Design a binder for this molecule. Structure first.
Ligand SMILES: COc1cc([C@@H]2c3cc4c(cc3[C@@H](O[C@@H]3O[C@@H]5CO[C@@H](C)O[C@H]5[C@H](O)[C@H]3O)[C@H]3COC(=O)[C@H]23)OCO4)cc(OC)c1O
Ligand SMILES: COc1cc([C@@H]2c3cc4c(cc3[C@@H](O[C@@H]3O[C@@H]5CO[C@@H](C)O[C@H]5[C@H](O)[C@H]3O)[C@H]3COC(=O)[C@H]23)OCO4)cc(OC)c1O
Lengths: 760, 760
DNA sequence: CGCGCATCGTCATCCTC
DNA sequence: GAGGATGACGATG
DNA sequence: CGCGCATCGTCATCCTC
DNA sequence: GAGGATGACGATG
């Protein structure tokens, strides 16, 4: 028998014929790994090995409709290549011999995503063939993640904990050239030949023992065990925190030779890392209200001044260059676009100015132009929310031996409450609606004095619909409807989280023609659409209008939309998760966390300004002594000159002293006292240096005199003053667009509420 | 009647109903322009305007199979929306009234590609409905290409010749902020409202008069008028060259108000610009053997040192940042990959080192990994072929007010003859095979003395097949076949321009099973494939083997492949095109063009080294006079100090003098004599300055003494010395891969030639 | 570049009962 | 020997 | 990211005659 | 009033 249906399959020689019990099959993720596998098979052969590339995340089958199972074609190809049958038990070895392939070796990237894909495949095999997991049927191929090189020598490393241990236990570190490997395509032909040469180290077989592992597989993909996953991740996060505090290095895998691998260790040590990473990258933080993807772009934009505009494609390239982004520019351009939209419902405040078309409110925001068609630039509010004097306060990382972005930021407003937070993770998810900036500023000003904060309500910018609060953490939103004449009706505004094209295709189309059980309700509909406002004119029957009035126009046209707030899950200043209940709790927590840092900023700016003033004073004294003629540098050895300078009282660079004092947690230094060009030896510049040092002394005195607080008040005042101009320009943008002569239908407005709260 | 088939269509209100003669339809390219059109229609309305986005280059219908016409679905959608019929004449106004739309307004980018798309649409309409082009049925919408801004003032510009005229005729230039527009998506909502507000300036109607225009349309898309297009472009290129030489500014369009536009002017002024641009971007140059897309990347790589490796995505981002690339990063990543492949048949020499997988010789080179999976870095041969001292020799451009890449480069070898040249343009196309580098070096060394060059033969790197020359500019290539036993046969090497997967699917599959008229010839086939070499073992019938031997194995398995050389078309040092005939002609032309620049390089390096030495001498003299104590700068005004320095004999910066002398085609300057820090006032540094100036004097003396020639010989010697190490590493790469124990079948080889030359 | 299909937890409706 | 058909390739939609 | 289909001039075969 | 079904969303395969 042979296979000729799909061209992508590279069938082996004895596939389906005799000795099929030894014929294996390689499964690779994506299509790049197929190139590595084919390039490698040149050494082993084509008899017992076949390669078939996958597409991406495989459909979960433990809980899915049979129709959806039949819809996927990739699973159908997998069964057609292997030869499995749904209701056929495989107990005897003859049943295994019936199949066309003996073993299945999966190989993917050495990251969390490959681990997730492997878990999905194990679940797929176990859900419908439990007996095949006790005959050595599945196996894994692994690759190195980082290599070193120095004088024709290299050392392979498979796990980061092993690389960290090698760094901590070995001297002469950094002499080797580090080289990170992210994708399988990074390797070359020589590396592939070396990998397939050492089969006893990469090829790893699985092993099954004990029925408990079956529950473990369920523990990973049971839609009825959400709380079980919650506890399973909470215990792991607590253990990791305790181990980090005690300083004991945690355990890893793949270090020495491994003949087999238990499923229990496979799940409780590898997939949980994917779960933790996903929760870290898909849930915002209560401090900066951002995600690591957004944070990298915001840091890269802060690194350069960018006075002019900039293209999005080159911006993403620079972000990948400096922020160490390793998730594909395509997934990053969408995030950059999301950080700039300002239409109704998207964001009450933006950080990137909208130069171009960043998507209207018609096609789900996905109707944006190509990334090379659009331009962008930092808004005036970006550098105001983040004072430039806060870089020294926060802690950074050193991914890829490179000063990289920090873990959070310290704004002057809670960013979670201004731009919302919507994310789906593992075990927990997040859903936080928007609010109004002025109410937040008023509440913070009220709390700073000591008074009690006031209850707030989720609002939006440029929105005219009504919002009603019935139960705590529950809200209802209603749009705008009017009755122009006894026959016509007008829809002016739709509620948030509603798109004009979707609303039209899902409401006007079913109502225009008669459905299977309802007569055609509406008769005519016309659209008067703009970039921001909408206008629907619907003509119907007068009796139908009276009926809708008796029933309620909002219910008929689906204007009342409900929302709840029970997913208030965010990170902490330490890194743990908390289930928040009220917005005032987030406000008080942010207030205290911000209050803790005034002393740190004051203590950092103080001392540093004093040291700069002292350095200027030392430079002035050196210039004055040189003008006096005491210091002679005509033909004097560099060494003797340093010695005579020291006996004066002259010290090293205080900036270097502060850098050393910060880094605590080649001799003397007098370079800056001699790096000044001869231009400094004139009175025209001596006067400027004197006035500059006097200005620095005045600034230091004012800092010593002013309170550690009261800087917050000045910053808020400046922010409000800037927001006034920003909103003025935003309104002028519509005022220029304002046509003037246009249809302007006006009619009595019906405002209604649900008769029954129906509180749970 | 209504339309509900395609969702992308935004139907108007009176479409298909009454007053359809006034209902227009907007056609936009791509999908980004749909966002601009929809955002703009908010002001005009939804009654007489409808938008339908296109996909890209529309299929030409003047010469295409009816089956292919039926295959395209976009044309079917266009007819279904409009309502046209193939064999229905439209003469009376009632026939026009029968249609569902009155007019068609096309809008695209203001570049050459939009012009090409508009021409394709006009051809499509004229080919099957000649009568519709005399009733005001088609129209064009235009947008600005660049804008200026200074103090709430702006001036629109539609053509570059108009912008150049405004720059040349108006003072106070550069005060306005320039802003280039490339894509329609760049504009904002306010700009769209302003565009649709001034309908009398953008909306332009067409006009037809005289049957000659019909021939003009044929002149643009007649597959039987290739020579006519050749003459039509040659006359235009000659006219442009003469106008540039005379300095008279050429004519443009769209400047003042335009009620109509003739087809003759539409074709002889706009589409010809697209033809010229396409020929410029799709044909290599005889000087550097590159194309502008390759040239931009090669310049961007030259700008930075890049000692370490670099990612391809960030590299493309930097190229778009500095090289002013405006054709999409996706089209640029493929070019970057093409500039790095080194497998058999791709390139005899590469400029980017292959770190990763850049595609094997199996899937057409298209099996390369994702651009973020691969790394790259400049090869050691890049900076050797292009000496660093040649940037001053060539002329640059100032696209976007930015120092950008030059027009060509001056290597030490003809790059056209080493990496081939394959391109398809308009009116002309190019096809130049590869050659051997050592033969080129030997021929250049032979020509430099004065001897006669030798005939060469197209060769390839890492190739074992035979090459035969029968007619001039014609060649035949044969692979490698052997007879292992009286039954089996072995194929070792396939000819160039042949892919293993394609050769297998197009030869082994038809031969394995019996075709409609042939019995199954082969019986068994097995593959022993590697990354570089191939091995096919085919088992067949002994009688069939004798029959194939009687007929010829090369003919049976398609091993002999012919190639011709009649498309030797390249640019010139001036910019014109020439139809070359022999390779020796290209070699002699390159030799003379290179010989012309030795004097220029010598004259540039001379004088410049002398000026640097003079500047060092002036600095040393100033330091010596200061040590003597004659020059006093204690408390002296900046102005009086300059005056006393001048009376000494001290001059300005000679580097500035050379920069001014080059730029020919605020007073005194003594900054560098005072920008030296105090460290220079010690003997330890005075000795170093003295030795440095002595070294500069020696270098200048050697330059004055050596011949203007003989630098070419030293550069060639260094290049050969480096190529020795490069080839040694390349061979070692296979030697490490060399498995050792493997199947090594050896058999008698049959070498054959066509019995009849069959010369034309 | 556009549509192609996938995870993962809450939930607002949506179709039966 | 003598004519029509067609895909091959590369920068861009 | 993979396959989706298009131009444009020469030409090596490829299927009839 | 009471239960199962399902798509909605966003960073990534
Ligand atoms: C096809 O070959 C591979 C594909 C992938 C996936 C992928 C997989 C898909 C799929 C699409 C995609 C696609 O994502 C899409 O991007 C789109 C970009 O425009 C925006 C508007 O909309 C996005 C889609 O929301 C998203 O779904 C790829 C982007 O980069 C990836 O990593 C994605 O539809 C079918 O299955 C991974 C691979 O190996 C690692 C592959 O070999
Ligand atoms: C769909 O929406 C639009 C598409 C386009 C075209 C395009 C058009 C296509 C089409 C594909 C393409 C595609 O090219 C493809 O890229 C591929 C990239 O990977 C490599 C391996 O292979 C390339 C294909 O050889 C090439 O054909 C686009 C890339 O950027 C463009 O400019 C291309 O197949 C169907 O018609 C322009 C638009 O507006 C301006 C659009 O709105």
């Amino acid at each position: 028998n042979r296979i000729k249906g799909i061209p992508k399959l590279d069938d082996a020689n004895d596939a389906g014929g005799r000795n099929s019990t030894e014929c294996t099959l390689i499964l690779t993720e994506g299509d790049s790994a197929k190139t590595l596998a084919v390039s490698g098979l040149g050494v082993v052969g084509r008899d017992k090995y076949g390669v078939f590339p996958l597409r991406g995340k495989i459909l979960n089958v433990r809980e899915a409709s049979h129709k959806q199972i039949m819809e996927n074609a990739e699973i159908n190809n997998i069964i057609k290549i292997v030869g499995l049958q749904y209701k056929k038990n495989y107990e005897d070895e003859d049943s295994l011999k019936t199949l066309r392939y003996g073993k299945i070796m999966i190989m993917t990237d050495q990251d969390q995503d490959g681990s997730h894909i492997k878990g999905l495949l194990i679940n797929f095999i176990h859900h419908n063939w439990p007996s095949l997991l006790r005959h050595r049927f599945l196996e894994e191929f692994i690759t190195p993640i980082v290599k070193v090189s120095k004088n024709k020598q290299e050392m392979a490393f498979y796990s980061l904990p092993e690389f960290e241990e090698w760094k901590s236990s070995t001297p002469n570190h950094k002499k080797w050239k580090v080289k990170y490997y992210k994708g399988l395509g990074t390797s070359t032909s020589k590396e592939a030949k070396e990998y397939f040469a050492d089969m006893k180290r990469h090829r790893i077989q699985f092993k099954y023992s004990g029925p408990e592992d079956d529950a473990a597989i369920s523990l990973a993909f049971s839609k009825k065990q959400i709380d079980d996953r919650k506890e399973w991740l909470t215990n792991f996060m607590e253990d990791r925190r305790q181990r980090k505090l005690l300083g004991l290095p945690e355990d890893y895998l793949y270090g020495q030779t491994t003949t087999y691998l238990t499923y229990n260790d496979f799940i409780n040590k590898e997939l949980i890392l994917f779960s933790n990473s996903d929760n870290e990258r898909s849930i915002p933080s209560m401090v900066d209200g951002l995600k690591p993807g957004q944070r990298k772009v915001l840091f890269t934009c802060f690194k350069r001044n960018d006075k002019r505009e900039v293209k999005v494609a080159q911006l993403a390239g620079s972000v990948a260059e400096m922020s160490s982004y390793h998730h594909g520019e395509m997934s990053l351009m969408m995030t950059i676009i999301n950080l700039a939209q300002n239409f109704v419902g998207s964001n009450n405040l933006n950080l990137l100015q909208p130069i171009g078309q960043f998507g209207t409110r018609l096609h789900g925001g996905k109707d944006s132009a190509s990334p090379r068609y659009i331009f962008t630039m930092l808004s005036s509010l970006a550098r105001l929310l983040f004072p430039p004097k806060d870089d020294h306060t926060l802690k950074f990382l050193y991914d890829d031996n490179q000063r990289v972005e920090p873990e959070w930021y310290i704004p002057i407003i809670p960013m979670v409450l201004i731009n919302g937070a919507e994310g789906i993770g593992t075990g927990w998810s997040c859903k936080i609606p928007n609010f109004d900036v002025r109410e937040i500023v008023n509440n913070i000003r009220r709390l700073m004095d000591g008074e009690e904060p006031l209850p707030m309500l989720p609002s939006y910018k440029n929105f005219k619909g009504t919002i009603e609060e019935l139960a705590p953490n529950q809200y209802v939103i209603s749009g705008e409807v009017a009755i122009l004449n006894s026959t016509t009706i007008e829809i002016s505004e739709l509620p948030v989280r509603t798109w004009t094209q979707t609303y039209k295709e899902q409401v006007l189309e079913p109502m225009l023609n008669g459905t299977e059980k309802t007569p055609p309700l509406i008769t005519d509909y016309r659209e008067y659409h703009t970039d921001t406002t909408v206008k629907f004119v619907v003509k119907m029957t007068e009796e139908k209008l009276a009926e809708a009035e008796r029933v309620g126009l909002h219910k008929v046209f689906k204007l009342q939309t409900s929302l709840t707030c029970n997913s208030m899950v965010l990170f902490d200043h330490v890194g743990c998760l908390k289930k928040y209940d009220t917005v005032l709790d987030i406000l008080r927590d942010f207030f205290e966390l911000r209050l803790k840092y005034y002393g740190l900023r004051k203590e950092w700016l103080l001392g540093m300004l004093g040291a700069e003033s002292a350095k200027l004073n030392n430079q002035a004294r050196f210039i004055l002594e040189k003008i006096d003629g005491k210091i002679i540098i005509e033909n004097k050895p560099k060494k003797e000159l340093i010695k005579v300078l020291i006996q004066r009282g002259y010290d090293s660079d205080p900036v270097k002293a502060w850098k050393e004092a910060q880094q605590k947690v080649s001799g003397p230094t007098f370079n800056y006292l001699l790096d000044m060009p001869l231009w400094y030896l004139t009175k025209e510049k001596k006067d400027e240096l004197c006035r500059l040092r006097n200005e620095k002394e005045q600034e230091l005195d004012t800092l010593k005199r002013k309170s550690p607080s009261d800087l917050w008040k000045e910053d808020l005042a400046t922010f409000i003053e800037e927001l006034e101009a920003v909103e003025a320009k935003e309104k002028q943008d519509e005022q220029v667009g304002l046509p003037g002569k246009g249809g302007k239908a006006k009619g009595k407005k019906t405002q209604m509420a649900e008769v029954l709260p129906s509180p749970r």
